[PDB]
Amino acid sequence: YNACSTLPMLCSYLPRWWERGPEPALPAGAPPPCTAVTSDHLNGNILRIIVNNLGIDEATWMKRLAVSRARPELLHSHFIPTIGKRAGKVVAEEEQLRLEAKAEAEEGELLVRDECRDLYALYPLLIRYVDNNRAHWLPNANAEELFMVGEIFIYWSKSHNFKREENFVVQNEINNMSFLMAKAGDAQSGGSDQTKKKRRGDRYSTLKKMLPIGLNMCAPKTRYALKDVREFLQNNLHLQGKVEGSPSLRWQ
């Protein structure tokens, strides 16, 4: 794949692209050597193939809907890093929602930890390999233009991060690092303040100031809504967990 660095020869690669429509994963691991050769193709028309590569990410996302050979798939996520599209981000929002439903299932394993969570800890390392691919997803200029659903999708990515605040399992996840981010996500939390009325908050120094009152909510997320746009109190509920996450940031 490092070695990558006749119009009909390109037609054979279109047939190689057809092999991808069929996608047993061990035969596919070697394709990442072929997918890295596609980076040489990027040198334009090859961006349409990268749109096809976006559907490839949606295919690895189906694995995410539900061990060490998955680490070799994380080495294929390393090939993703060379590739590091917005409708595919909505499919990535479906991938993150798949990760949301699954990380909340990992949280149910943590309820078992109350009296065991060690099998979740291997999933915690495998969930970390998913997060490698999120660095490739981090592109964020398009999210600036969203400040909505892209952010609400990031809110879905964000809700999952509340469970990272919850403990000994994460030390087993540190062991994955021994065997071997989220602040850029916080861009999206600010979208709750909204466009030109957000400039008015600076006159107040508009919703972010009421959101700053909400930082006090987490000192005590049903309670954020109790004080009372109730959807904006639900945006404060994202901030309520984020401030108790800021108490976790005291560790940092």
Partner: protein
């Protein structure tokens, strides 16, 4: 006795301490007023005496009644002894007024002793904004240009409208509108030469020499004022609409290229009948519209320009850069005959290649070199018809490779030597068909083509006024795409031969007021040029005089290459494509700093709060920039990213006002030497004199500018004991290094040239193990006394002007200089004579240095332009609100004192003073 001055001062302080809280002490001191005044004259520990007097005045009206009409004059004189000490003024206002009542008389004496005296107290007035205009081309033969006056509005606003016109050069004239020089902008430089207003005449040093016009008139929307300048000799003479303004300028340095100038003020327009001539008098001249020779088209410019009128806002800009007559060898070094045969081979190959190009136009060989069609001797083998009918190659191409040994190349042997059916003669060249040159060797081809064109250029003076006369250093890269790349075709045969081919910086800054030490703060730097643009936070205290980079106080990021600088380079970043705005973010409380390329996060993490950081631009000499801070609208690519989110608010959210800033000014206005210069020691002492020395090993030159102008008998003296340019300085001056002497005369003609005498001189002076002394007499005209002995004096000027006595020493490392019929150190002060010497607090030592930060000015000019006529125009004048240091006069807006606040304190006390001077209703 060395403890003794401290002791005495300590005693005054004691006494003072006894005085501040009581009336009675003062009552006892009422008899001591004459005594106190007797003691104030002392010049070493006067401050305590001052506190004394002060408190006494605070607590004794009677003493105000008593004080004599001259002891007070002794006090004003004290102030003149001490220069700018605010305390004395507090003393004065204390004199003015009692417990409530006042002695009106002594106050009126204060005024007559002050206000007419002008010079002691700082004083102020105002101008209107001044704006010079120039044609784009600098001159370095005789030239001529035309300037019709479309419009004048002489008396709008309090000022008479400015509209001076004259010649100038890029070093002694750098017109920054925000003040400088005694109340103006054009006509001020020794390097600039000028004209205007009543009686025509001129301004140099902003001196109004009143050479009368043949007849007459001012400047009104009529005259086609016009100018000429002979080459070498600066025999400038203005002309009023076809009537020359007599004999004028003569004999001046040609230090750098000369260019035409037209300053203006108010609602005024002027047209250039150039491209349209009207009046072209003979002086060996050639017209200036024809002066569009280089790449640039002819055009007006406003000179220097530190704020171009850009779209979203005024861009920061300048200086860019700027020398031609000189052929520089194409046939020097000999070509060895082993290679000369291949010189004649590759030349015959490229001559036959000359046959494979022009024939496409239908040209054909045979035989006379007719200009018509189908007739050249060149379309054949080069050997056949001597070396003039085939001068296109081996007569000269063989010489061109002699240049390859002469223009800076050391060539070696390395490889074996090497269809239209066209009319006349038909060889198709090989190996020119597969050419592969090394890319620097095309630049070497530029040296070859230029060096060769230069010799033709030297007879070009014997000619229409060819645009070609200038060297390829300044030409289109189209004619250069021909004459240089055609030389590469001779070099294209060499690839077949296979032979080897081995081979003023600017700065800007925010208001100190705005030095936040707390709060969150993003800030913009909108891009223009992608060069050394570098910008970042910095503490105010750093010299803008120092170049940015290696300084503790100024964390910054480059506009190019992309490593950040602090205390030299600290690499981490990357550069940017032009027009990519560079924003940045700073935590406060937390120390971190983070530069961003349009919101692209990566900077100076972990530092400390201090003075309070400010943004600071710093352009390279060629580079151009822009800035805007605050306005929520200023949130394009950049603040819209992390800036909206993290709460890092921009400056102008806080304020209605646009931010004030200071451009650096390459002009070295004098400043007093700080203790801790990198090192120039100085020591005052009693025969009164002072001592000197470089001490540490350290670099070039000392422009030793003593502050004090001579008034219009007295000797003045400066021994030296270790090559050095003695010669008393002109106050308005500037430039750096060498200067022997790179600094001036004017005929006072009556058009005839008979002249009512002719003058102008010292616009300074220069000189070259016996010690060196200087006892020059004055009052009048200058009388030099080189090496103690008399040696004549070329200088002589006394139009009642004030001027400097000083020297530009080059250091001999250790003990650089000594320093000092009746002694001068007295007449300089008001109480002339009082003959005995008296060194004192205002005996200043302000050396000129370099770059300093003058204010940007929030608003100034509204100029509008035009072409196929160049009828430039501008509208409503706005004031140069300003004051000046009365000595060495230099207009400065008062607000400039806000930051060099010591003078603000002095001024403010002047105002307290006057306020006391009113005496509650004195009229």
């Amino acid at each position: 006795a060395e403890s003794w001055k401290e002791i005495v001062n300590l005693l005054y302080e004691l006494l003072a301490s006894l005085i501040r809280g009581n009336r009675a002490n003062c009552a006892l001191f009422s008899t001591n007023l004459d005594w106190v005044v007797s003691k104030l004259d002392r010049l070493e520990a006067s401050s305590g005496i001052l506190e004394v007097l002060y408190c006494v005045l605070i607590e004794s009206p009677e003493v105000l009644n008593i004080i004599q009409e001259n002891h007070i004059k002794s006090i004003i004189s004290l102030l003149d002894k001490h220069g700018r000490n605010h305390k004395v003024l507090d003393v004065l206002c204390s004199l003015c007024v009692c417990n409530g009542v006042a002695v009106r008389s002594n106050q009126d004496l204060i005024t007559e002793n002050l206000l007419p005296g002008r010079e002691l107290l700082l004083q102020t007035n105002l101008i209107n904004y001044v704006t010079s205009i120039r044609p784009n081309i600098f001159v370095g033969g005789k030239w001529y240009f035309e300037v019709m006056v479309d419009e004048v509005v002489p008396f709008l606003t309090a000022q008479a409208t400015h509209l001076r016109v004259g010649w100038a050069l890029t070093e002694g004239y750098s017109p920054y509108p925000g003040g400088g020089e005694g109340w103006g902008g054009n006509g001020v430089g020794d390097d600039l030469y000028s004209y205007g207003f009543d009686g025509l005449h001129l301004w140099t040093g902003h001196v109004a020499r009143p050479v009368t016009s043949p007849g007459q008139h001012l400047l009104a929307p009529e005259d086609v004022v016009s100018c000429c300048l002979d080459l070498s000799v600066p025999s400038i003479s203005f002309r009023i609409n076809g009537c020359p303004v007599q004999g004028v300028f003569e004999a001046f340095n040609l230090d750098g290229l000369f260019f035409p100038v037209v300053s203006f003020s108010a609602g005024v327009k002027v047209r250039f009948l150039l491209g349209e001539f009207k009046f072209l008098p003979p002086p060996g001249y050639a017209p200036c519209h024809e002066a569009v020779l280089p790449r640039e088209r002819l055009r007006l410019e406003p000179i220097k320009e530190y704020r171009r009128e850009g779209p979203r806002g005024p861009h920061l800009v300048g200086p860019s850069r700027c020398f031609v007559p000189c052929p520089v060898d194409t046939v020097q070094i000999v070509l060895p005959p082993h290679l000369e045969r291949i010189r004649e081979k590759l030349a015959e190959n490229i001559h036959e290649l000359w046959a494979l190009t022009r024939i496409e136009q239908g040209w054909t060989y045979g035989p006379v070199r007719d200009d018509n069609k189908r007739l050249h001797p060149c379309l054949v083998n080069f050997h056949s018809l001597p070396e003039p009918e085939r001068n296109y190659n081996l007569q000269m191409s063989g010489e061109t490779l002699k240049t390859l040994l002469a223009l800076g190349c050391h060539v070696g042997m390395a490889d074996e030597k090497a269809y239209m059916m066209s009319n006349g003669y038909k060889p198709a060249p090989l190996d020119l068909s597969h050419v592969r040159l090394t890319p620097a060797q095309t630049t070497l081809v530029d040296r070859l083509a230029e060096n060769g064109h230069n010799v033709w250029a030297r007879d070009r003076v014997a000619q229409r006024r060819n645009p070609r006369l200038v060297p390829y250093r300044l030409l289109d890269e189209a004619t250069k795409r021909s004459n240089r790349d055609s030389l590469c075709q001779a070099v294209r045969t060499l690839l077949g031969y296979g032979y080897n081919i081995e081979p003023r910086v600017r700065i800007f800054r925010a208001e100190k007021s705005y030095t936040v030490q707390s709060g969150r703060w993003y800030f913009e730097f909108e891009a223009v040029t992608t060069g050394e643009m570098r910008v970042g936070w910095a503490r105010p205290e750093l010299r803008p005089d120092v170049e940015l980079g290696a300084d503790e106080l100024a964390y910054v990021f480059n506009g190019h290459r992309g490593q950040r600088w602090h205390l030299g380079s600290e690499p981490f970043g990357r550069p940017w494509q032009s027009g990519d705005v560079v924003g940045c973010m700073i935590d406060l409380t937390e120390n971190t700093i983070i530069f961003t390329l349009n919101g692209e996060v990566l900077a100076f993490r972990e530092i400390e709060i201090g003075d309070g950081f400010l943004p600071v631009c710093s352009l390279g000499p060629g580079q151009v920039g822009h800035l805007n801070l605050g306005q929520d609208v200023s949130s394009l690519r950049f603040f819209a990213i992390c800036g909206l989110q993290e709460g890092f608010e921009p400056f102008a959210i806080n304020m209605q006002r646009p931010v004030t800033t200071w451009f650096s000014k390459s002009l070295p206005q004098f400043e007093p030497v700080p203790p801790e210069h990198p090192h120039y020691e100085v020591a005052r002492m009693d025969l009164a004199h002072r001592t000197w020395g470089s001490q540490n090993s350290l670099v070039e030159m000392l422009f030793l500018r003593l502050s004090l102008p001579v008034q219009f008998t007295y000797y003045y003296s400066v021994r030296v004991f270790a090559c050095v340019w003695v010669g008393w300085v002109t106050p308005d001056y500037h430039q750096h290094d060498m200067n022997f002497d790179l600094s001036v005369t004017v005929t006072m003609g009556d058009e005839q040239g008979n002249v009512h005498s002719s003058l102008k001189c010292s616009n300074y002076m220069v000189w070259g193990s016996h010690t060196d002394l200087v006892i020059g007499c004055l009052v009048g005209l200058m009388t030099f006394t080189a090496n103690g002995k008399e040696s004549n004096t070329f200088f002589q000027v006394e139009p009642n002007t004030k001027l400097f006595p000083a020297v530009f020493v080059l250091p001999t490392h250790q003990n650089v200089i000594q320093f000092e019929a009746a002694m001068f150190l007295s007449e300089r002060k008001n109480p002339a004579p009082q003959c005995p010497p008296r060194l004192e607090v205002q005996m200043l030592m302000p050396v000129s240095w370099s770059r300093m930060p003058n204010h940007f000015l929030q608003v100034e000019t509204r100029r509008a332009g035009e072409r196929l006529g160049w009828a430039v125009q501008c509208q409503d004048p706005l004031t140069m609100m300003a004051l000046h240091i009365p000595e060495e006069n230099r207009c400065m807006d008062i607000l400039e004192l806000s930051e060099r606040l010591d003078l603000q304190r002095f001024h403010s006390h002047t105002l307290r003073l006057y306020r006391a001077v009113c005496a509650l209703g004195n009229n």
